[model samples]
Target: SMSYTWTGALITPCAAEESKLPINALSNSLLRHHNMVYATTSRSAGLRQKKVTFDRLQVLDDHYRDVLKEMKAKASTVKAKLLSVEEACKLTPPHSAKSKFGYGAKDVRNLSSKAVNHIHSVWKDLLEDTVTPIDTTIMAKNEVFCVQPEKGGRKPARLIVFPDLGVRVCEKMALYDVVSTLPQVVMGSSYGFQYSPGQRVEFLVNTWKSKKNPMGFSYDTRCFDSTVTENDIRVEESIYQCCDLAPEARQAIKSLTERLYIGGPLTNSKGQNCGYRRCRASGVLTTSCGNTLTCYLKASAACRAAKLQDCTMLVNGDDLVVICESAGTQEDAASLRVFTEAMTRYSAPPGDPPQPEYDLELITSCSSNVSVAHDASGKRVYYLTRDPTTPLARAAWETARHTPVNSWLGNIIMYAPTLWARMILMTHFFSILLAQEQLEKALDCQIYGACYSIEPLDLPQIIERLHGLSAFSLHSYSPGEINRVASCLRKLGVPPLRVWRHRARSVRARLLSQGGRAATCGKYLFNWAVKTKLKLTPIPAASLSGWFVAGYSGGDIYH
Candidate 1:
């Protein structure tokens, strides 16, 4: 009854005003007009009864294809340009270049370094701006909830421009080979050891040494014996020997002679405190080592410090157990604090505290130290074991297992940056997945609810039927309707051009012979016709009429 009453009402004055307006002007009108129109119209009712739904898949697929095509085209263009630049650089003789005189070598090297730095800067910018491989789930989630369609009777759609970091990196790397340069290799390798960016050889070796001997002392009977001999002393001395440098290596070393070796507290490549007095002191060294004594002592001290620290902090099984179990919860926070304090206290070799119960657990506890509650409804519980094969169980154990809240918090704080980045990417990917799932659920709900209803036309079929019908053409309206509409359109400042006539005559003999007045009248008529077709105001008809009268008075009405 409510629907019938609402639908049966006649159009109001506002509706009449709206219906009389040109199609282009309709968009500017308030949305209430559309709501009213849909409410009163039988066609709108029929449309609702059919339960028409907008197909977003077509839009999304089209967008995806367009983006990929655009990216491919841009990438190809960049690659081709880069290839040309590379060829040019190779063909240009280094000796003939402008910076090829005294001190030119240094200048060229500096220029090259600058260029490399610039390229790195560009890469950094691209990475920052471009949407990198975020978790697809998080993207899907944001798409579902954050992006909104433009209001009014417009189609629901959104557009997003993807970033170009990957393309930039790929193209730049293709253009130049950084790995080929010996200097780059040496610098990169040295920095890598200090910073631990890539494969860490020192860490690997230290790990091996720790596994070989849990305790710091050697197990051999000769090492334990109090008696001293030349062979034993010599063998002990051999441990500190530094290998002699080759002629070429010595020459290469000369190049680095002028370099300063300012040192400070010994820290790992990651800037973490190494926690050894001698190592820290050597880290502050500025002078170049002239003999094997300094080199051997420094290297040995570094190695020993690394090993001592490993034995002190790493051998504890309970520490490792805490690390594994409290990886996710508050327990991890507290455990991490304890681990840090232990590291600080044992900063020096042979000065570390005695092994405690927690420390013992680090080595002895099996990987299955934590459990997970899988189902809240039932008593389904799962345990996380030390085995690497049980990935899901391990993840569950790490994230859900209970531990000291303070330790977990501390650990969480320490790894906050990594955790934050992971969480953000993961959330983004999950959101996308959730959106797809929600869409499926909505579709299912619609299908089930409509199972008993009259069969509705599919969207494509409806579109085809629409195409078959004559379009709602303004020109095809009834003559009376056209006249009324044109009058209304004119009232709304839109002119009707097809119903106009023009006449022009020239009073001057030369003008009349040239037919200039007639040409002028024809031009004005053409412009008016175009404006009418576009539903725009013609050069004010009244103004044009006034000009015509003035022209006639000036003896140049037509040509």
Candidate 2:
């Protein structure tokens, strides 16, 4: 549902605006003689400091209750019954991390020896300890953030939530389908990944007044995942409880929550006890799912309380996009203040810009911005993009033993038409994958911290589900963006887009010469390489469920 923060010590130095005295005011000879000076900072810098203030009191208002009621009721309508132990086991990856019980993923998958019996015992133990929070392990996640480069240094080392193997299995058994299907059920079209950039733009433009200048903007909740309070976690459990279930299933779910969902103990790198976490844990199975639902419940209700007009939302965990009627210029600022206040009352505050926007194209959701650039054909094109920071960083890591997800591949598939994406991301990554002969391997990338098993040949449907038919049809580069991309490639010692293009052309040709999935991947992922665009062909359902079900994802689901 989000990226990508926690840069290590290379993070920008911290000193707030208020911390500085008016040194400039002491320009008189007396103070000037001492030669001590500090310049004023930018509003943008000020934004970074004020973006998140953690001390706000969380007031549960009527809107909060209203949102939870409708949301919980909607969640109730889902028919996600718990799966059996064997069925759940089958869903677990065969290569999943081994257990302390000496039963590896393969052993569990094959029902080898007495592994299944041990798994059942683990499940019983999990159920028995209903009120105790489950123990979890934490790992540092290195992710890339956008840099203007001229102003940047090292990248942030983000962290991901990881829980015990047994608890993970129980989570899947209890709520895998729930996490997969529940967001669409509760939030409907507002679920972020459910819509493509084109559809998302259309939705906002259509919902709000779209006459020439339609008012729309994204809301950034600083450290959104970290801010998930314990009450928020409890609210999520109650929302699940509202769902219909067999008595045992319901009991199991409740036990799972008390033990794992509500909050847990935190252990650091050296096995030191870093105390306990009462707030939502980032590394857990339900994190992204729970955050999306909880944020929606709060924000949706707050929108009502603020009296914002026609509030249509697309929430991805904490990343939010709100499109509604413009309250006029003067009122816009004031209304946002009230909405911001409403948000704070609900225990959420606005991030940088600390306000909303009335421009659709300006809003950046999921780190993607809608802008205009020329395709390879030298024609103007409008598409979605963000700085290629994450993809670029991920690509650099693929050169080594880094365990990072292949975000570059996923980005290329979803944002295939974008200039930076097509030229750099596609040309670069596919060239590497082809060189390594890893194109056929099931990719271990993530969305909302849930790991999916994505085969390269599944591009046809996966691309279709993400962006529009445009995924295969867009052309060229942003002359400047391309130049900047070129510089980044060079600085990083990666091959240029040109070499990769030649490489991809051969790959595409080879794929078309072959039949089945290879041909399909070539057709969809490389259609831009051909002058004539091929019609999008739907992959069979059985093939899709075989290759496209993103296994461990919390909020993402596919056809």
Candidate 3:
């Protein structure tokens, strides 16, 4: 029996549809300054977030057409590389939330009868009912805050919409590529997560003229998935149509869209059914895996309507950063006003009172802040970071199961050499994995429901596909960022940074000794830990099978 899933659940004003369970994750009576953290940060963090409510936070925009246009253009430029069902099946990892039919995640992994029999009808229905509505099972997702305070604690429960088991498979079939690569294709380098923390800042700076005083602000949508209008769902449909999909595949896309894409009903732990929903369900394929593309679809269009400069964007589901043409403060004010008018007029409901920043530093997206400080070798570094709260909290989880990939992994992978990731995440998680003896036990994990045989070796292949080739070249943390990390570590009873430095030396030396992918992970992921850097390289693309779900495409990795 799984424990405490719905035990302390309660409803709140913000996430009234779902239940929440409050928890005090990191607290110490003696080791202090958490109040300082909340004071210095929470005020602003909760401010924009709290102001964002159902009244104004839906991310809809007339710009939907423009973004969709960009997407169609991008899709037209590339060839369709649809995945086979067997590959997507073999990639299915353990812990896929026990299938609805009768088998566990393990059964599906082995191609047992239970998966095809039960997980199939849900698939067949999509073919039959191209526009029918599908319901989702809502649960109270209790997670530890890793500087991810806005996720839980006193904050409202994030409404995670878990579709039926078959839905996840269909989602993988239709939208996996969209989630992994479409944003960059449609928005270009403006896609933030695609770059290292420091690199993204550089892009923003260069693009927005982020002089010392570049005016930028991230947009926050309240319950963005739930608020996505039915028409907004159709816009995403058009972008998919741009792809030269096979007719059946194309129908599946539309059927999935009509039945599963649009919002459905909600059910409680007690089996109490809630009524019909028309907005985006945060639990569906789009919100969990592909919504970032659609959200950007609308946002790109909004930016054009706002008439901002080059209109560079970085969007990962409602958390957006726009580095538009900056001008006089007065003019900046006027542009922001127009931006607001255009976006809201389209339906991007804005509950959070918008906040602005200068110099590209203050604006934080993906729960990461781009801050500067010196690295271990005493070099100025621009790295993406937040306090290590979320990474540390999630590390405790990653040390256990074949942990699924999320922003924590993405941030560190993109900015592995960054001060925080190298210093905090690498140190803690490596130590934990070592203690559990799980590092080389054939690690497995899921992405948007499709599984991959993830190994320490595959990171190189994975990162290079989504991020740029420069991920290997760019490199560390600032001294200020380093000190803040240590202070929080001591407060949370984690081993100090130096312990990780020592552990990293051991972790890297041991990993490199194993050779091949082990050596690759050690050499690239932990390059910052060593004094002399190794010649960085990409993974064998053919070798990606049994390791990762996506393939790297470029001159260097093509072989």
Candidate 4:
């Protein structure tokens, strides 16, 4: 089946879009090569559309059916509850798109009667109609990235297809509990979204160490959502149906599976028919969960077909990393070829052909890898790290342009224990905040797709709680990790690590001179900047409420 069937109508933007990086007084201070950073705009939607549109052919074998039956058996043990309108409304994000009906996200969050009434109607409609295609607004996403000149310079904007606010609310009312509970229950330890950063690192390390001569590789599917067939979506729905759910919930799930999940008509912001989607909707409630299940099922079946021994897969949506016993270099290579062939036959082809890595650090999944560092105790510590090119590029953009989410803050929290994140990200952003006298100001950022308003001054306590006091005192980073950071800085035209250290020293002193949270930030966050470090201790006030618990990628959660 075709992933998309176009109507010759354009995918239009609702607002004016910026392609070039906007310059400010602070932009040059952070990055010397301003032109290297570019933002995607609506102009490139045609290019993206061409790349994503495709035909999918899947041939499932007994291995696929076996995994499906096993997943269903586990899923059947679980019972999920339906959420009330108010319960679902409370989960809506503050800045989520307003309803085509009169109410906005603010009204939904505040439990406005109009929004509640409309949501009820939408839910009622789901029970009655099982065949009408739900309307979804298609928009091109604007994102910042360092231009990859080798890959045809700036990449085009990706499409985000989402349904109306009322239907989104109804989606939560029906399947919120199922999504939250089922993935973990079925996937068990392999469910990548269930772990925090530290726990994720631990899991990767333990899995790698579990095998003798462990070999691993990350599999990258070429446009995974486009590869999702109608049969695959139905398979995912059948798995959901295995769970013991409320009768209305069961009917609503079945209705949504036919109406929204399998396929739907796409409309632009201007209300023109853009096309029809028979693949995964990137912005729907089932996106993350469905992608994970489908990817896992296909890969697990592929693993069996390839006959890989004791393969442990870490799956988060379309990203997959597998660690298994190495038969031999030649044998491992041949086995991976068979695995790729099986996955390709299943309609999920690799973007880059998989390569087996004997060393654990070489395999990257979820844009992160397990890297070694030394804690204050001088013992080797394993932590997750990723290339900083995108983060640095986005930070530079955020500094120059006024944006809603502070991705730098979220990166700082999620990757606090890493070398580049603690050194460059913290030094660069905190220095800017201090200069602007907004250190105490709370800025919003998304974690696992949920929005959070976090104050900069509270970073010390937050870091301590999330990454621990070792984040403050860790030193003597592995040479490979240090070189990666140095290389990234050079590539981005950002200042060298030494220059950032000098600047952080100055920022640290200034922060220390101020009292309270400012001093705490200086003492804990920038300890690596000074020769003499203060004693790191737990902050009694640090509390992580409603954080790092579940996957909310399209949940529209706000806190």
Candidate 5:
């Protein structure tokens, strides 16, 4: 892992070493400053500012709506032309070579291109013009850099510049300093300097010297009084005549004394090193795939910790959908409302409820095989079933029975009629079995035959007697009905019904092979079912699927 060091002042309160501090001491200090600022910029002032901001936003909103309307109109026009061209193509020769080479293909291609361009233009325009800007400034502080001048100039006045400004100033200032005499002060540390008579000034002035260490220093000590008084002149006269001063020393001394005096330099204390090993081990400090994961984890953790309730997850690289379940709380809901309002203030348009059918179908079909059962209290007790067959049941039996398959198919007839048909089939078979007296007669006849049969001729005559029964009697003792009666006699449990898995597989394979019409029929059925349940429309598959497959020969069998 790469390693580096940064130094800065530790600004603890004056009494921290003496006694325990109240929790609000630090907060109150901050709050005092905040309240002061807030009082200066009162609610009425804020309201006036907000009103101006909102008026500007309203203007932009109207402008945007106009643009959206124009674009939508353009899109509709192009879409209509494309539809017309598509119909024309459909009317052309089914499989003729001439159809591929002539106006049929050319017109379709042209219209498709035009439609695509219009859609692309509208989407691009909407995104570029409508999206809100993110606020990254730390707080209400508009000044990016702060400088604090020391009182009385007895101590060094700290010049706190932004990183960029510091770099630029450091480059220009490096030339006047002496390298050998310079004391190395840690970068970013707060230094204390006290100006005194004949106290040598030693400081590093950073400039573009060597690329690595662009800094050097200068040192001089002398005192002069700047006050317009007879005593001040006498003090300067005494300093000027001082012995053992370099030629440069007199000039440096004069400069120092003329300026307000203070301490020279005091670097921040060097404390114990904190290990970066954990960051390295966790791969957070690396530049690999693990680093990306680490970054994302850190960001997510920060977002949660900061209670960023309005944040959203991305879908299809285009949609932002909120997924923080915890935001259902009242506090979070209020926070999100404020955040959304702030976002709108910056021009982010409200998102439309994406076509409901697609979202519902995606959610439902993706987990179709799962079922939840609830207790009397309405809490989920357990999952009743996860069998894939249950989804098939819902699709084939429940949905088909309860809902209208189309505008022509009514719900009442489909569900009730099919149920009645099954009942009738079961009753017809059961009645036939009852009329035969099969259960009682079979048991009794077997016993009698065992006791009275004398020879093979006798057995044949006995069997002939049973065969002489009427059609109704025989029908009553049909194989299925007889087996059912035997099962009842033994008190056997109902067997699991066998699924026609092979038939389903064969159907799917056949649809894939049949190409055009079969695929469309299947897609349309899926879409229609989804639409019926979710109250939304699906993007038609026929509009998108033709590039890979040709033809739509199959009927509504799949549907």
Candidate 6:
């Protein structure tokens, strides 16, 4: 089946779009080659459409069926409840797109009588009509990135297909409990989102070290969402069906699966039919769960077909990294080929051919890798890090434009211990916030797909709570990691590390002079900047901050 069948109408934008980074006084202070950084707009969405649209071919075997049965058996132990209308409304993000029925996210969150009545009506409609195709709005997602020489100048905007707000709320009512609970139970340790950055690194390291001759690789599927077949969606539905659920919840799940999950009609923002989607919708509630299950099922079966021994997989949605015992070099290479062949037969072909890596640090998944850094005690510590090209570019954009999400804040929170994030991101953004005198201001960002309005002044405690004290005092980063950061900075024409260091010192001094939460930020977040660091201690407020508990990618949570 084709991933998409488009009508003559085009995918339109709701408002004006910017393709290039807008200039600001602070933009040049962080990055010099602003032209290299650009955001994808609807203009390039045609190119993206060409890339993602394709026909799928799938062939299942006994291995796939066996894995499915085992997964179902585990899933049967779970029991999920249907959320009340009030509960579902609370899950909606405040800035979510408004419904066509004349109510907005604010109305939903406030539990307006109109919104509640409309939601009940929508749920009733879902239970009654399981055959009619639901309508989804298709739009190109505007994302930021730096120009890559080999991949081309820029990537096209990714497409997002989502039903209206009413349907979205109802989706939460039916499946929120299931998505939050089922993956962890069925997948157990293999579920990647259950771990924090520190725990993720620990798991990867332990899994790698457990093998005498460990072989690993990250499998990148070519257009994973498009690779999803009706059977795949139905298989995911079957897993959910195994759960003990209320009769109304069961009926609603079946109805949503038939109407919204399998496939749907795509409409533009202007109310015209844009296309039809037969693959997975990127914006639905089941997107994360469905992708995790499908990817795990295919890869687990592929491991069997290749006869890989003692395989351990870390799966977070479409991203997969498998660590297993190696046969000799020649045999490992051949086994990877067999693995790729099996995945291709199952309709999930590789974007880049899988290569066997003997070193754990060499295997990258989820755009991050395990790297070694030293604590204040000089003991080796493992933390997650990534190239700063995209992070830096997006930070530059967010500085000049009032974007909906503060990705820099999220990066600083997630990668607080990394050299680039600590020195460059924290320094650059804190300086801006200081200049504007908005350190106490709360800006919105996402962690594990849930929205959070975090204050810059609260970062010291947030970092302490999330990454622990070592994140504040980590030093002597590995040479490989340093080289990657330095090379990325030079490639993007970002100022040298020395300049950021000097700038951070000045920012650190300014923070300390203010005194209070700002002083705490200076003492904890910028401890690495000064020649003589402060004696870091645990934060009193660290435990009170509710962060990094679970993944809510499509669950539409806010805090």
Per-residue lDDT of candidate 6, residues 144-169 (tens digit): 98987564667889988899899999
Which residues of candidate 4, in runs, are more than 4 Å off? Answer: 149-152, 543-545
Order of quality (lDDT)? 6, 4, 2, 3, 1, 5
* True-vs-predicted CA distance for residue 88, candidate 1, Å: 21
TM-score of each: 0.18, 0.77, 0.71, 0.97, 0.17, 0.98
What is the C-alpha local distance difference test score of candidate 3? Answer: 0.55
Q: List the candidate 6 regions with Cα displacement exceeding 4 Å.
A: 150-152, 544-550
lDDT of 1 by residue, 114-233 (tens): 433443454444334432221100000001111012233421111111112222222223221211121112222221112110012223233334453232211011111111122222
Q: Report the error of model 5 at residue 123, Å.
A: 21
Per-residue CA lDDT of candidate 2, range 1-559, in tens? 1111221212222233321223222112111211112122322322332332134357888878888888878888987778776776776665565665677777767766667777677688866778876776544433433343554443334444456556666776778767777778888888865655556555655665554444566777667764666678778888777767667667778887787766666554445444454556665567777888888887787788774476778887788877777768777677666777787777776666545666555677877766555533456656676666556554444443334356766676556666567655665555556666776888776544445667876666776665555556665545645666677655544466666566567767877776677777676677666656566655553232323222234321221
Which number leads on lDDT? Answer: 6
TM-score computed on alpha carbons, candidate 6: 0.98
| Model 2 clash tally, residue pairs | 13
Q: Please, what is the whole-model Cα lDDT of each candidate in the order they appear?
A: 0.21, 0.61, 0.55, 0.89, 0.21, 0.90
Residue-wise lDDT of candidate 5 within 236-353, one digit each (tens)?
A: 2222323233443333333322221110121111222211110111100011111111122222222343343333221110112222324334554454444344324322323421
What does each candidate score in C-alpha RMSD? 35.5, 10.7, 8.1, 1.4, 38.9, 1.4
Which residue pairs in model 6 clash with each other? Answer: none
Report model 2's TM-score to 2 decimal places: 0.77
Of candidate 3, the 10-residue stretch with the lowest lDDT total is 550-559
Runs in model 1 lying further than 4 Å from the true structure: 1-248, 252-258, 262-425, 428-559
The global Cα lDDT (0 to 1) of model 5 is: 0.21
Provide the clashing-pair count of each candidate structure: 52, 13, 27, 0, 13, 0
Error of 3 at 442 (Å): 3.8
Assess the local accuracy of residue 309 in candidate 4 as a C-alpha lDDT between 0 and 100.
90
lDDT of 1 at 292: 16
lDDT (Cα, tens digit) per residue for candidate 4, span 72-189: 9999988999999889988887889999999999999899989899998988899999999999989999999998946357788998999999999899989888988899899998
Poorest 10 consecutive residues by lDDT, candidate 5:
218-227
